[PDB]
Ligand binder design. Structure first.
Ligand SMILES: *[C@@H]1O[C@H](CO)[C@@H](O[C@@H]2O[C@H](CO)[C@@H](O[C@@H]3O[C@H](CO)[C@@H](O)[C@H](O)[C@@H]3O)[C@H](O)[C@H]2NC(C)=O)[C@H](O)[C@H]1NC(C)=O
Ligand SMILES: *[C@@H]1O[C@H](CO)[C@@H](O[C@@H]2O[C@H](CO)[C@@H](O)[C@H](O)[C@H]2NC(C)=O)[C@H](O)[C@H]1NC(C)=O
Lengths: 218, 49
């Protein structure tokens, strides 16, 4: 990018995290579901205390609800804030079984500098690596039914009544990795077929409703 | 009605038992709502239980 490279070049010595999640959720609806085009999006950031630790807990939490499915995606850091800036939904509003696509991306440092994790002899990196958690939860909200060190640490929790499948690719990496041979910060996470959803998600706008929330930069 | 598809590797620091048929077994832990396996952290639910 125009903004990007000229920034990255200016900070050879730094490490800025970048989080990306592409996720496809197999959806199905209840008999009573009533098609809707609605789409609810939120990104909210929390600070909590571990009294055990000196460190504070920083969670960035992205939520989206379309198609009767409600999705939560929380990235929980300990002493370190990786903040989300963008969430994208792609859904089909109909009653039929379909797929739901979720993008989540953290803030771009060239847009609004995150913290530099290399500092203090890499203090932050040891944190991300040692205690970073990814929590993804998926529910059929409001619906009523008839009755190794590179691997990201994620809990993936879902409701089988509306969720038929989940596949996702997720990455937590050095933002300027495209200008580095190595980076101490490079985390990967797959569930199901990630390499697929990473391609597929890049072109569902033809046959899906698409909503997106982007946070103010600055 | 939860069904856990991926657990957290790092046990830290009420409960549920996903064994309601389900795809897999698990312990959802209220804390977020984080997901677990059967290995050692059964301390918290079987040791602190
Ligand atoms: C997840 O993130 C990716 C990356 O931002 C999004 O990919 C983008 O997808 C759109 C449509 O899905 C592409 O649209 C482009 O413009 C016109 C639309 O009229 C289309 O005819 C072109 O052929 C072209 O596809 C865009 O190129 C694409 N960008 C990249 C880098 O892949 C995707 O929308 C996001 N998924 C969501 C919100 O579900
Ligand atoms: C999706 O939405 C449902 C309904 O909003 C959430 O489940 C309820 O959570 C409330 C408290 O917020 C509980 O008292 C209810 O017992 C829960 N179930 C129902 C059917 O109301 C659910 O947590 C949401 N899931 C996600 C991932 O956000």
């Amino acid at each position: 990018s125009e903004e990007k490279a000229n920034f990255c070049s200016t900070h050879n010595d730094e490490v800025y995290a970048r989080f990306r999640l592409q996720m496809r959720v197999g959806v199905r609806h209840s008999p009573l579901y009533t098609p809707s085009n609605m789409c609810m999006l939120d990104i909210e950031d929390s600070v909590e205390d571990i009294e055990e630790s000196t460190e504070k807990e920083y969670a960035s939490t992205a939520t989206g609800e379309a198609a009767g499915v409600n999705v939560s995606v929380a990235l929980v850091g300990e002493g370190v804030s990786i903040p989300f800036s963008y969430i994208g939904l792609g859904f089909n509003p109909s009653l039929e079984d379909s797929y739901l696509y979720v993008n989540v991306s953290s803030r771009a440092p060239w847009v609004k500098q995150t913290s530099d994790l290399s500092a203090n002899g890499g203090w932050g990196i040891k944190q991300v690596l040692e205690k970073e958690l990814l929590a993804i939860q998926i529910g059929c909200d409001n619906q009523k039914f008839p009755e190794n060190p590179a691997d990201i640490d994620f809990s993936l929790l879902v409701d089988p009544r509306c969720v038929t499948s989940v596949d996702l690719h997720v990455e937590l990496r050095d933002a300027c990795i495209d200008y580095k041979q190595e980076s101490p910060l490079s985390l990967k996470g797959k569930y199901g077929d990630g390499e697929l959803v990473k391609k597929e998600i890049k072109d569902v706008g033809k046959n899906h409703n698409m909503c997106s929330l982007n946070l103010n930069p600055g | 009605t939860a069904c856990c598809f991926s657990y957290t590797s790092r046990q830290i620091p009420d409960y549920f038992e996903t064994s309601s048929q389900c795809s897999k077994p698990g312990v959802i832990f209220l804390t977020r709502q984080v997901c677990a396996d059967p290995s050692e952290e059964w301390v918290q639910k079987y040791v602190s239980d």
